[PDB]
Design a protein around this ligand. Structure first.
Ligand SMILES: O=P(O)(O)OC[C@H]1O[C@H](COP(=O)(O)O)[C@@H](O)[C@@H]1O
Ligand SMILES: O=P(O)(O)OC[C@H]1O[C@H](COP(=O)(O)O)[C@@H](O)[C@@H]1O
Ligand SMILES: O=P(O)(O)OC[C@H]1O[C@H](COP(=O)(O)O)[C@@H](O)[C@@H]1O
Ligand SMILES: O=P(O)(O)OC[C@H]1O[C@H](COP(=O)(O)O)[C@@H](O)[C@@H]1O
Ligand SMILES: [Mn+2]
Ligand SMILES: [Mn+2]
Ligand SMILES: [Mn+2]
Ligand SMILES: [Mn+2]
Lengths: 312, 314, 314, 312
C-alpha cells in the first residue's frame, strides 16, 4: 500500500506533538528490531534458552537506542544501568519472553514491556524502576501467534500494529481500541481450584451455572498470559490469575507482566485490580515483586470486586 | 547453516510410498496439500492487513483435485461430498476441514486444517458412500497448525511425524520422527462453561483431577479453544482433551468424518485412545458425512482412568 | 488477492506427464529440483551475511537422487558422472551446473542453475556412457535464474514455459505459457575484450551490427557476463548471444553437456537456433561429459545472418 | 545475530557525532521503507508503470519523514515542495527506479538518490536543488539483484548494507569501501560505436588490443546503470556513458543519476568526470539536466582523461 502508516511513522507523528527529543521514537524503533528477530527465531525454532537470545537481543537494541538508562528484565538479577555515552531519559521493564516453556506446544507467546521516564536528578538506579504503573508513559506487548502483533498503549490510546512480513514493518491495523463493557468469557487456571479464595470460587460458580436462566459464560485459558490478555482485549471477557495457596502473591510479576497489561487494559476502558486495589496504583518495593491480577471488560471485573468485599 | 540433506516431507513420505511399492499416489496428493496449507498460512499471517475459510476451502479443493489422486472429497463446508470430475481421477477420498476454528483468528489463537484420507473400496463410478468408511480404514490422517509456527503433523501406518514449515525455502522439514505421546499426564483440557450440561461421568472426573482424592498435584487446566491447538498440546505434552456431549450439542459438537476421526487416527497411532465415551471413535459406521460424534483423547492412562468410570455409570 | 487456482509447476507439468501416460517420474524429479533451486536462492539472497556452488552442487545431487528418478548425474563440478546407488534408481540422466557464474555473486550480477535431462536408452547397469547422449535426445531442459526474481524457465516437448518463485508460498507460479522468442532483434551479446582472438566471421558480424552497412539502427550491446542472464535477455527480448571460440579456449569455453546443450534445447524449442558455428549444438556426439563446445544463439534471422557468413569463410 | 548493526543503528551513531537534529536518521529510515516495499514489489512483479508505485512510495515516505522540503524526481515535471507542517532541512533528488524497462529481462535494477541540505533563508524552491554534487551531504543507491543492497556514502565513507529479508533490516556488511586503483574491466554501450568521439574510441582500442603484449581488458555492460556502477565499485574497472551523436549531453541525468554515483565513486577513491570536468564540480542549471559520465578505478579513468586532452 503506497501510504503505509508504520509504527515508526505513527510514533513519530504523535511525538512531534509533545515537542520532544525523538527518543520514544528511537526506543520503540529499536524495540521493534528485537521483536522481528525474535518473531523469526520462533517461526523456525524447531528446525535444527531461546529466552537468552531474546534477552540479549532486547538489551542490546535498547542500549543502542541512545534512549534508555535503566532496563529491568525477567531474566537478570539486578537492573541494567546504561553506559553514559549511550544514556537517555527512559526506563524499560520488560519480559523478553513470556510463557517460554509453551513454545514447545506451539502456544501463542509474547514479549511484554513498559516504559517509564527517569524524573529524578541523580545516578540512574533501580529505584527509578520503583514507580507505580500509573506513571507509565508507554506500554504494550508483542504477540507471536499466527501473525506477529504489537499492541502499543500510549497516553492517547491503545492501537494494534501487525507485522507485515513481506516488508519488515509494523503496520497499524486497529485504532483507538476500546474493550467491550461485559463479555461472555472467563479465563483462569481452573486446576488450582482447591487453592482459590472464596470470592473467586463464588464468581466462578456465578458464571458456570448463572442463577439468571441465561447462557453460562464460556471458559478459555491458553496458559500464556499474552494470548489470554489479547483475547480479553479483543473479544472482551475476564482473565484472572489470583493469589492462592501455591503463590499467596500471585505468580505474575508486577513491573514487567502485570503493570503493562494493566495499563493497556485501563486505557482500553477495562479495569485491572488485585481484588483489594488497582494494579497500577501499587508502589513497587522490589523490582521483581509479584501481584494478583484480575483484568478485563469492566462490568465483569466489577462483578468480582463486589464479590470480593461482599465476602469482607 | 545451509544443510544439503533437508528431509522435505516430499522426500520423507517417498521413503514410505516407494519401499512398499504403492505408486506414491499418496505423495502428489500430499504435496498438493502442502501447497494448500502453505498458502493458507501466509494469508493468515497477513490476515489482518488484507471469509478466509471459504477461500481456504476452495483452495484445498482445487489443489486436491489436481493431485490426480482423488475421487471424493468432503469438507466441513460442503454438503454433498464433492465427487471429482473423471479426467483427474485417482483413488483417494479426502475428508477435510479447511479452517478449524475460523472465528478465532481475530483473537490470535492458533487454528488449523485437518484431513483424513481413505482409499476407495469399490469397483464402480464414485459416490459419497465411498466416503462413508469408518476411521479404521483410514490410509493416513494429519493436520496442519498455524501457530507461532506452521507445523504439519502426519500420521500414516508406521506412526506419526511432525514437520515444520521453513518459510525461507517453503518446505516442511521433519523435526520429530516416530512420535509417541506420554503415558500419564498432568493436564485436562475441556470447556467448563458447559458445567451444568456435562454427563456425570465427566463431572466426577473433573473433580478427580481438580481435587485429586489420593493427594497428588491438581491437574493443570488448559483450553486454547481450537481443536487443533488442543490436540497438539495433548499429543506432545500429553493430557486429556475432553469434548464430550452436553444437551446443546447432544450427540457432541465435533463432526466425525473430518474432525474427530483424523485427530483420532493421529492420536491413537501415537499411544492414546480416542473414544466417544462408549466406543472408540474410529469404529462408528459413518452415516452422514457431517455426522457428529463426541470425543475424548490423549495418553492412555487418562483416557482409561475416565473410561472405567464411564463404564461405572451406565 | 489470494487466488485459489495457483498453477504451481508441480500441477502444470502433471498436466503434461499424465495426459501422455508416462509415470510423471519427470514430476517428482522436477519437484525436487525445485527444492534445490529454492534453497540456492534464499542463501544467495543472504549470501553476503553468512564455496556456495559446492554446497549448491551437493544440494542438487542429494535432492536429485531422492526424486527416485535418476541413474546418472553430471555436474560441471564433478569428474566422473555420479552413477546413483541402486535403491533410489530411476530412469533419468540429469546433466547440470549448480551455479553458473559462481564468481560474480560478489558483484550482484544475476547467476543460475542449468539442467538437462535424458532418459536412459540402455538395458544394463548404468554408466556415464548413458550420459553421453546428444542434445537431440533430451527429454527436457531448463534453468533457474537468481536475479531480481527467481525465475525457472522449463523447456519440454510442447514448448518453453517461464515460472516465477512466489516467496511467500514458496511455489513456482506460471507467468508465460507456450513461449516464442522473436524473429529479428536489435541486440548482440558478446565479450569483446576478446577482440583480437575472434574468428573473422564474427569480426565482420560485429561491424555489421555496429555499423549497419544498410543504415539501420546500430544494434545494442549487452553482456551481463553470466550465461544464464544472457540467455534470458535473449529468450524474451530476442537478440544474438555469441560465445564463439577464440584461441584461449580454442574449442570454446562453454561445456556442452550441461551448459550449451540445455540452453540450446530451451532456446531452439522457442524459435531460434543454437549452433557451434559449423553445426547445430544439439547434434554433436558427447564425448567427455565435460566436453566443451562453442555456441551462438537466439532468434533465427540473426543466428542465420551470421551462419551464412560462417559458410562464406571456410 | 544478537548485536546486529543495522543501517539505522549505524546512521544514528554517526549522527550523534554531528550533534544534530536526528533528521538524517529519520530520512534514511524512511527511505529504507520505500526500498523494502519496492524490493518486494520487484521480486514478484511478474505474478498476476512499477515506476509510479515506486515514485508515489518514495515521495510519501520522504514527506512523512518530517526531514525534507524539496524532492526532485526522474518522474515529475517540477520539484516537490514539502508542506510546512512536515518540512525539514533536507533536499533529496532521486530516481525511484532506474532501468525500469529492464525489469522484464530480470536485470539487476535500483533506486538512486542524493541528499543536499537547504542552506538558504527563504521559501524552499528548485534552486535549492541547483547545487553542485560536490556539496552533497549524503548519497548512495539501492540495488535489486540476487539480494537487495544499499550502498550509502556519507562524509566518512562508503559502506554497504544488505537487506536481511528474514527481519526487514539493512545489515552492514562492507565497511569503508575503497575502489581498486586499476582493474581489468571496461563498461560502455558498444552498439553506439559509430557515435563515439575519438578519445573514447582510441581508449577502447588501447584496451581491446593492448599495445603492451599484456592481457586485454574484459568488457561488461548490464545496461542498467546501477548494476554496472556497483560492479565497478567492487571488482574495480571503468564505466562509461559518453556524450555522442544520439545524445550530445550524455543520456544520464545529473542530479539523480550521475552526481550520487560520482559522489559514491570519489569517496571510494575513484574518479568521475565528463572528460572535460568533474561531475560533482558541475553547477546544475536545470534540475533535469544530463551529463557525460566516465567513472571508475582512478588510473583507468585518468588514462582516458589524458587521452581526452591528448586529442585536444
Ligand atoms: O517467564 P515466563 O516463562 O513467560 O513465565 C510466565 C508464565 O507463567 C504463567 C503460568 O501460569 P499457570 O501456572 O497458571 O500455568 C503464564 O501465565 C505465564 O506466561
Ligand atoms: O469452528 P470450527 O473450525 O468449525 O471448529 C469447531 C471448534 O469448536 C471448538 C471450541 O468451541 P466451543 O468450546 O465454544 O464449543 C474447537 O475445539 C473447534 O475447533
Ligand atoms: O563461471 P561458470 O558458472 O563456470 O560459467 C562460466 C561463465 O563464463 C561466461 C563469462 O565468462 P567470460 O566472458 O569471462 O569468458 C558466462 O557466460 C558463464 O556463466
Ligand atoms: O529512468 P530509467 O528507466 O532507469 O532509464 C535510465 C536507463 O537508461 C540507460 C540506457 O542505456 P543505453 O541507452 O546505453 O542502453 C541505462 O543505463 C539506465 O538505467
Ligand atoms: Mn514472563
Ligand atoms: Mn471445524
Ligand atoms: Mn558454469
Ligand atoms: Mn533512471
Amino acid at each position: 500500500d503506497t501510504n503505509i502508516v508504520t509504527l515508526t511513522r505513527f510514533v513519530m507523528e504523535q511525538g512531534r506533538k509533545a515537542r520532544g527529543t525523538g527518543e520514544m521514537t528511537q526506543l520503540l524503533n529499536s524495540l521493534c528490531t528485537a521483536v522481528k528477530a525474535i518473531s523469526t527465531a520462533v517461526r523456525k525454532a524447531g528446525i535444527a534458552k531461546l529466552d537468552v537470545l531474546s534477552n540479549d537481543l532486547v538489551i542490546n537494541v535498547l542500549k543502542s537506542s541512545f534512549a534508555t538508562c535503566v532496563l529491568v528484565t525477567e531474566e537478570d538479577k539486578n537492573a541494567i544501568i546504561v553506559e553514559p555515552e549511550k544514556r537517555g531519559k527512559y526506563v524499560v521493564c520488560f519480559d523478553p519472553l513470556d510463557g517460554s516453556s509453551n513454545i514447545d506446544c506451539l502456544v501463542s507467546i509474547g514479549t511484554i514491556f513498559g516504559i517509564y521516564r527517569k524524573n529524578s536528578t541523580d545516578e540512574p538506579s533501580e529505584k527509578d524502576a520503583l514507580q507505580p504503573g500509573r506513571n507509565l508513559v508507554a506500554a504494550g506487548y508483542a504477540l507471536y501467534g499466527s501473525a506477529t502483533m504489537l499492541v502499543l498503549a500510549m497516553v492517547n490510546g491503545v492501537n494494534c500494529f501487525m507485522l507485515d512480513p513481506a516488508i519488515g514493518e509494523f503496520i497499524l491495523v486497529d485504532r483507538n481500541v476500546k474493550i467491550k463493557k461485559k463479555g461472555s468469557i472467563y479465563s483462569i487456571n481452573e486446576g488450582y481450584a482447591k487453592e482459590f479464595d472464596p470470592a473467586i470460587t463464588e464468581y466462578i460458580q456465578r458464571k458456570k451455572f448463572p442463577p439468571d436462566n441465561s447462557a453460562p459464560y464460556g471458559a478459555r485459558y491458553v496458559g500464556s498470559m499474552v494470548a489470554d490478555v489479547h483475547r480479553t482485549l479483543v473479544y472482551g471477557g475476564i482473565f484472572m490469575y489470583p493469589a492462592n495457596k501455591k503463590s499467596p502473591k500471585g505468580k505474575l510479576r508486577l513491573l514487567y507482566e502485570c503493570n503493562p497489561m494493566a495499563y493497556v487494559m485501563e486505557k482500553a476502558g477495562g479495569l485491572a485490580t488485585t481484588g483489594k486495589e488497582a494494579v497500577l496504583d501499587i508502589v513497587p518495593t522490589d523490582i521483581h515483586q509479584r501481584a494478583p491480577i484480575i483484568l478485563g471488560s469492566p462490568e465483569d471485573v466489577t462483578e468480582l470486586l463486589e464479590i470480593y468485599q461482599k465476602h469482607a
